[PDB]
Amino acid sequence: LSPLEQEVLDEYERLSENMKKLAVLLDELASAPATEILDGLRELERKTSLVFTLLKASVYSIVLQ
Amino acid sequence: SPHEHQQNLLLSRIITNVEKLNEAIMVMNKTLQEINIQNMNIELVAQMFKNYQSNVLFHLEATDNLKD
Incomplete structure (x- = not known):
């Protein structure tokens, strides 16, 4: 059947194309920014510790001392 | 005798100045004692920023410091 052929062919073509887009996009999107x-x-952490963690340090130091 | 009367009178004005002096000193110490209470807070904050500067300096020197 040519209509069935057209249906399944076009639909699966869209699915394959979308899956290629999925693989590429998902990989880049979730790999590139991650690092x-x-x-x-x-x-x-190295910076925020120098404002907040030192605040805890000074607080402990004074309250204990 | 008359010398003694003169001496006693000078001593009287002396003693009056003594009492006035010391009463003012009582007010002085009382004032400072009340002030003292309003200084420990600031002292704590001073030492807090002091040790803050000390610790952050030690850590900056540990990492890539950006001083002279």
């Missing part, structure tokens, strides 16, 4: 995120965040 940048964790790098900036380990540095963020």
Whole structure:
């Protein structure tokens, strides 16, 4: 059947195309920022500790001393 | 005798100045004692920023410091 052929063929073509888009987009979208995120965040720990963690340090130091 | 009368009178004005002096000093110490209470808070905050600067300096020196 040519109508059934057209239906399943076009529909599965769309699915295959969308899945190729899925693979590429998902991989880049979730890979590229991830490294940048964790790098900036380990540095963020190194920075935020110098405002907040030191605040806890000074507080403990004074209250205990 | 007359010398003694003169001496007693000078001593009287002396003693009056003594009492006035010391009463003012009582007010002085009382004032400072009341003030003192309004200083420990500031002292705590001073030492807080002090140790803040000390610890952050030690940590900055540990990491890539950006001083001279």
